[PDB]
């Protein structure tokens, strides 16, 4: 599906709006992206 994440997802002003949610790496897993 189509799409703010402005200016960047790292320092976005509304983290609840940007679909790229920040998570942590678990045991036996890799970086999701």
């Amino acid at each position: 599906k189509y799409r703010s994440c402005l200016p960047d997802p790292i320092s976005t002003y509304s983290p609840n709006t940007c679909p790229q949610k920040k998570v942590v790496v678990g045991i036996g897993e890799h970086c999701p992206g």
Binding site: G26, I27, G28, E29
Partner: protein, 49 residues
């Protein structure tokens, strides 16, 4: 989708298109009892296994 090899289907079994050999992590064959009424399977994961 898949087709039936016993009788036959008007379509053709086409679910992959990779002409070369893709990278595979597991490829084995297992034989099951053909004269059986019900089959049971489990599929779960934990810690990437």
């Amino acid at each position: 989708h898949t087709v039936c090899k016993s009788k036959g289907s008007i379509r053709n079994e086409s679910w992959h298109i990779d002409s070369s050999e893709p990278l595979c992590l597991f490829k084995k064959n297992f034989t099951y009892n053909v004269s059986a009424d019900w089959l049971y399977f489990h599929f779960y994961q934990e810690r990437g296994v």
